[PDB]
Design a protein around this ligand. Sequence first.
Ligand SMILES: CC(C)C[C@H](NP(=O)(O)[C@@H](Cc1ccccc1)NC(=O)OCc1ccccc1)C(=O)N[C@@H](C)C(=O)O
Ligand SMILES: [Ca+2]
Ligand SMILES: [Ca+2]
Ligand SMILES: [Ca+2]
Ligand SMILES: [Ca+2]
Ligand SMILES: [Cs+]
Ligand SMILES: [Cs+]
Ligand SMILES: [Zn+2]
Length: 316
Amino acid sequence: ITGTSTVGVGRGVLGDQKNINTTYSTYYYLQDNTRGNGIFTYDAKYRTTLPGSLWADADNQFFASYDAPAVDAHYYAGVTYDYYKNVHNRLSYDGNNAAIRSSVHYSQGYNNAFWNGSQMVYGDGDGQTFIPLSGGIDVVAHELTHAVTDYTAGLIYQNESGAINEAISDIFGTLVEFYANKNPDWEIGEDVYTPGISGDSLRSMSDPAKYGDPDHYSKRYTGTQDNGGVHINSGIINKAAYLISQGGTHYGVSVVGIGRDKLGKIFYRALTQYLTPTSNFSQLRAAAVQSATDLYGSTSQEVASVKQAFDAVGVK
Ligand SMILES: CC(C)C[C@H](NP(=O)(O)[C@@H](Cc1ccccc1)NC(=O)OCc1ccccc1)C(=O)N[C@@H](C)C(=O)O
Ligand SMILES: [Ca+2]
Ligand SMILES: [Ca+2]
Ligand SMILES: [Ca+2]
Ligand SMILES: [Ca+2]
Ligand SMILES: [Cs+]
Ligand SMILES: [Cs+]
Ligand SMILES: [Zn+2]
């Protein structure tokens, strides 16, 4: 909408207070004009029609329980925009400052979040498996990263290319979580998953197998559920990324860690310059090796570490 940029205040899903960029024109709308061509957050009102209505508020204060998922979807989209711009010199998901749109309160008891080809969408959860999913910064960045992937490598959402698509979203979701630097970890969704169980998460990148996800290519899922295991076999790539950054010895193979920032540079370059819609795990290894060679040189530790990490997870 046309209006003037304003700054509201509210509380997110976990009860934390934060400022949000809004737009005033009769109402205060969740429209952040400070980033690209805008970040826009909508109310889906417990229905499945999208996007719903641009979020409107009478007083620019967002402390109601019903407001909390919108506050976080809007704020964490801003953080994710900042990460891609400041760290990778990428302007929104399309590289040309496309407007970023999110809807919250999607459906009833909806235990998921998604990118629908045009926008992000967040359920409220059923209060048992999830609380409102925009409360997880890693979740928000996971979803926006699907948009980045769709505009770049275009990895098809099935089998190995789809597991790479998923891992890219978990990797950058985690790197955004570290960028914001509030309780960062290598787990996925811990802030919104299972409010009655402490210390768990939807997935683990540091130890995927804690939930039965594979941590080696010889344990990959080969069936048809989950689009051929895209959220399962992602563990193999998540583990490799974790090893590249943090190091470790895994199935007897030692990896010298090179840190999160170099992991992000290598995988961002792989995603945007080398991967294609049909890339498999072996082709991802080759893309990461070439990306590290471009950035750091063929004789570099960074290249050696990429090879060690894929060796450790059984990907040649
Ligand atoms: C991080 C976690 C809290 C949420 C995360 N959801 P997500 O993987 O982003 C998923 C959502 C979805 C919902 C409904 C139908 C299909 C898919 N896909 C998705 O948005 O694809 C976007 C895409 C991919 C490829 C090409 C175009 C577009 C997830 O790990 N969900 C688990 C529980 C699961 O669904 O098993
Ligand atoms: Ca209000
Ligand atoms: Ca965390
Ligand atoms: Ca996390
Ligand atoms: Ca939990
Ligand atoms: Cs789990
Ligand atoms: Cs399969
Ligand atoms: Zn996903």
